[PDB]
């Protein structure tokens, strides 16, 4: 497959534009809103892109809400990503995480429980698990309970995770092994297993075909968008990309490329970096 996924929200480049600006590009297909960085007590952070709040401090983001709807009219998928570098999140047990599934459904999905909605009447297309605190409690139970609740909705919903390339991942490995997940946005950067390093794509294939509860899970080549975007692992060689893309694009388990983040990949020229990669995907396709 040929999808480009981009994280958006954390303003890695400094020059982050509105969510809809990136959706109005031909260059990306899936958008991970970064992040619900605090839970189970809810807290969002989208850098400069949302500053208003409900009275209780929870972000209230009318521009992002409108942009989710615009993005979706244009055929894009927009998931809410949980986690990030805050580490201001943790489940004590599965029961707590199951209760939290309902909370997410009613707050961000098509649940009818009357909760405060950061995105008003906009409805996300699902949830990404970008967990970074090396604590795995609750995520598989959360994902599983979400799958039951989604049947009440009126569109398809997606779950994804954002492991780093070392396998198994210390934060989302359990989730990946014990829940039905649609997409794995694997960070092949900041690690020994970078595409230039000891590229461990084959391990992730073995995972997809033999371990993943969803045998049809799609694996994404996760990359920095610019120099800049990451301490190590940024690629310029169109180069290995072409070959790498070629090497990995043969399997039905290949879903495409995932980028950290939109602000970086769209502004970094090299022609916007995201455009170079979109075109390598279709032409390598
Ligand atoms: C694939 C491409 O991007 C990801 C998520 N990466 C990511 N998440 C959270 N904080 C980060 N900081 C650098 N990269 C980060 C997976």
Domain boundaries, the chain: 1-285
Beta-carbon-side half-sphere exposure of residue 83 (alpha carbons within 13 Å): 22
Identify whether the C-beta of residue 175 lies closer than 8 Å to the C-beta of residue 136: yes
Classify residue 172 as exposed, middle or buried by CB count within 10 Å of its CB (0-12, 13-18, 19+): buried
Q: How was this structure determined?
A: X-ray
Cα gap 44→143, rounded to integer Å:
19
The string over 81-98, giving b where at least 16 C-beta atoms fall within 10 Å of a residue's C-beta and e elsewhere, is bbbbeeeebebeebeebb
Cα gap 85→94, rounded to integer Å:
23
Beta-carbon-side half-sphere exposure of residue 95 (alpha carbons within 13 Å): 0
Identify whether the C-beta of residue 82 lies closer than 8 Å to the C-beta of residue 146: no
Taking CA atoms only, the protein residue closest to ligand 1 atom 3 is 260
Degrees, nearest 5: CA angle 196-200-204: 140
Identify whether the C-beta of residue 31 lies closer than 8 Å to the C-beta of residue 71: yes
Give 130 Cα–ligand 1 centroid separation in angstroms.
7
Residue 158 beta carbon below 6 angstroms from any ligand 1 atom: no
Phi-psi region of 134 (alpha: psi -120 to 50; beta: other; left: phi over 0): left
The resolution, in angstroms to one decimal, equals 1.6
Q: Which residues contact 261 (CB under 8 A, 6 or more apart)?
A: 6, 7, 8, 9, 10, 11, 12, 13, 16, 34, 225, 229
How far does Cα 31 stand from its chain's mean position? 7
Cα gap 7→219, rounded to integer Å:
16
The CATH T-level fold of domain 1-285 is TIM Barrel (3.20.20)
Between the alpha carbon of residue 64 and those of residues 214, 220, 239, the distances in Å are 31, 25, 36
Of all atoms in ligand 1, which is nearest to the CA of residue 261? 3
Identify whether the C-beta of residue 159 lies closer than 8 Å to the C-beta of residue 181: yes
Q: Measure the CA dihedral 157/162/166/168, to 10°.
A: -40
Identify whether the C-beta of residue 19 lies closer than 8 Å to the C-beta of residue 69: no
Q: How big is the chain, counted in residues?
A: 285
Residue 8 beta carbon below 6 angstroms from any ligand 1 atom: no
Residues involved in catalysis: 132
Identify whether the C-beta of residue 165 lies closer than 8 Å to the C-beta of residue 142: no
Cα gap 189→195, rounded to integer Å:
8
Which is it for strands 30-38 and 3-8: parallel, antiparallel or unpaired? Answer: parallel
How far does Cα 161 stand from its chain's mean position? 6
Phi-psi region of 176 (alpha: psi -120 to 50; beta: other; left: phi over 0): alpha
Between the alpha carbon of residue 176 and those of residues 106, 183, 196, 208, the distances in Å are 24, 10, 25, 9
Taking CA atoms only, the protein residue closest to ligand 1 atom 7 is 260
Cα gap 154→150, rounded to integer Å:
8
The string over 127-155, giving b where at least 16 C-beta atoms fall within 10 Å of a residue's C-beta and e elsewhere, is bbbbbbeeebebbbbbbbbbeebbeeeee
Pocket test of ligand 1: the residue of 130, 176, 235, 273 to mutate, having most ligand atoms within 8 Å of its CB, is 130
Identify whether the C-beta of residue 54 lies closer than 8 Å to the C-beta of residue 14: no
Identify whether the C-beta of residue 281 lies closer than 8 Å to the C-beta of residue 27: no
Residue 258 beta carbon below 6 angstroms from any ligand 1 atom: yes
Give 162 Cα–ligand 1 centroid separation in angstroms.
7
Identify whether the C-beta of residue 111 lies closer than 8 Å to the C-beta of residue 143: no
Pocket test of ligand 1: the residue of 261, 264, 273, 277 to mutate, having most ligand atoms within 8 Å of its CB, is 261
Cα gap 179→45, rounded to integer Å:
26
Q: Which residue matches tokens 């047990």?
A: 93
**Residue of 70, 43, 75 lying closest to 59 (CA atoms):** 43
Identify whether the C-beta of residue 194 lies closer than 8 Å to the C-beta of residue 188: yes
Q: Which residues contact 36 (CB under 8 A, 6 or more apart)?
A: 42, 43, 44, 80, 81, 82, 83
């Amino acid at each position: 497959n040929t999808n480009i996924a981009v994280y958006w929200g954390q303003n890695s480049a400094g020059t982050q534009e509105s969510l809809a600006t990136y959706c109005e590009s031909s260059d990306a297909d899936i958008f991970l809103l970064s992040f619900l960085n605090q839970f189970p007590t809810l807290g969002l952070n989208f850098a400069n892109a949302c500053s208003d709040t409900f009275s209780d401090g929870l972000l209230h983001c009318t521009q992002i809400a409108e942009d989710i709807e615009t993005c979706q009219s244009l055929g894009k998928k927009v998931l809410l990503s949980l986690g990030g570098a805050s580490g201001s999140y943790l489940f004590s047990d599965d029961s707590q995480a199951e209760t939290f599934a309902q909370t997410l459904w009613d707050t961000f999905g098509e649940g009818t429980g009357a909760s405060e909605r950061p995105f008003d009447s906009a409805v996300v297309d699902g949830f990404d698990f970008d967990i970074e605190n090396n604590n795995e409690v609750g995520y598989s139970a959360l994902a599983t309970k979400l799958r039951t609740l989604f049947a009440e909705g009126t569109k398809q919903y997606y779950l994804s995770a954002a492991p780093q390339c070392p396998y198994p991942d210390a934060s989302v490995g359990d989730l990946l092994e014990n829940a039905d997940i649609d997409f794995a946005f694997i960070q092949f950067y900041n690690n020994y297993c970078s595409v230039s390093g000891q590229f461990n794509w084959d391990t992730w294939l073995t995972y997809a075909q033999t371990v993943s509860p969803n045998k049809n899970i799609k694996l994404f080549l996760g990359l920095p968008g610019s120099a800049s975007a990451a301490g190590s692992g940024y690629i310029s060689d169109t180069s290995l990309l072409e070959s790498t893309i070629a090497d990995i694009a043969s399997s039905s388990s290949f879903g495409g490329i995932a980028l950290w983040d939109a602000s970086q990949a769209f502004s970094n020229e090299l022609e916007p970096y995201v455009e170079i990669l979109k075109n390598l995907l279709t032409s390598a396709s």
